[PDB]
A paper describes a structure:
Red fluorescent proteins with a large Stokes’ shift (LSSRFPs) are genetically encoded and have a large difference (approximately 100 nm) between the excitation and emission peaks. They efficiently absorb blue light and emit red fluorescence. Recently, based on the conventional bright mScarlet RFP, we developed the LSSRFP LSSmScarlet. In this study, using the previously reported LSSmScarlet LSSRFP as a template, we developed pH-, photo-, and chemically stable LSSRFPs, named LSSmScarlet2 and LSSmScarlet3.
To explain the high pH stability of the LSSmScarlet2 protein and to elucidate the effects of mutations introduced into LSSmScarlet during its directed molecular evolution, we determined the crystal structure of LSSmScarlet2 using X-ray diffraction at 1.41 Å resolution. We observed the LSSmScarlet2 protein as a monomer in the crystal at pH 6.0 according to estimation by the PISA server in a fluorescent state. LSSmScarlet2 has a canonical β-barrel overall structure with the DsRed-like chromophore, which consists of 69MYG71 amino acids and is located in the middle of the central α−helix inside the β-barrel. The MYG-chromophore in LSSmScarlet2 makes five direct hydrogen bonds (H-bonds) to residues R71, W94, R96, D147, and E216 and additional H-bonds through the water molecules to residues T112, E145, and L200. The phenolic hydroxyl group of the chromophore makes two H-bonds with the side chain of the D147 residue and with one internal water molecule. The negative charge of the pair D147/phenolic hydroxyl group of the chromophore is balanced by the positively charged R198 residue, which is close to the phenolic group of the chromophore and forms a solvent water-mediated H-bond with D147. Similar to LSSmScarlet, we attributed the large Stokes’ shift found in LSSmScarlet2 to ESPT from the phenolic hydroxyl group of the chromophore to the –COOH side chain group of the D147 residue. There were six mutations in LSSmScarlet2 compared to LSSmScarlet: I74T, D170G, D177H, Q189L, Y215F, and G226D. I74T substitution results in the formation of a hydrogen bond with the S218 residue. Hence, the I74T mutation was the only one responsible for the improved pH stability of the LSSmScarlet2 protein, and among all LSSRFPs tested, the LSSmScarlet2/G170D mutant and LSSmScarlet2 demonstrated the highest pH stability in the entire pH range.
Author numbering: 4 to 66, 71 to 226
The structure:
Amino acid sequence: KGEAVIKEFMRFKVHMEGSMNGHEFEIEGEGEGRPYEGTQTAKLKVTKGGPLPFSWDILSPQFSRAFTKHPADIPDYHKQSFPEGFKWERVMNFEDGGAVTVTQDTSLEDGTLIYEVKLRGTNFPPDGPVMQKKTMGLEADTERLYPEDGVLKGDIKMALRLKGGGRYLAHVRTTYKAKKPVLMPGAYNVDRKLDITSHNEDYTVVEQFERSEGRHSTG
């Protein structure tokens, strides 16, 4: 059924189980958006291990690949994968040695997208900006994707804003795997900006917004 199945308005539910420097936690949330316009929002709640003793900015990019706008000539790998869906596998590596491995499953149940996330973060300095909660959101960035063996492989130069000024950098590498063969794009870029739009004081309830749009590279 493919893109037919992804409607101009879609809802999702998400659950994450994670650990950061051995601190176990869980998140549950729900979201919605306009998949063809590249916009979405989510409301997340900490359901275990709260209040989190680390930056929310580690978690925010783990909460939705059906919601990227494409120009007419770039086929949408993720939208085509439905109703079966897809998985992804990510490594984030930060300038001070922090490391995060993340896996995700995306399915569709009764017209709602279902996301299950598993996260493990290690090697964060206990007095660094992530474990001291001294970051201030993700800067806009670009994911360079290329096709290989029926999967997409992405690379991001990510930047977290520091409280008081400056940037805290990471590289993000992800493989995106449809559960059935789909029409492959060529190599292309996805430009993203993800904002935390509201939160309670202890970040046990958080809302975020993301705009995502695919484009060709010029070289």
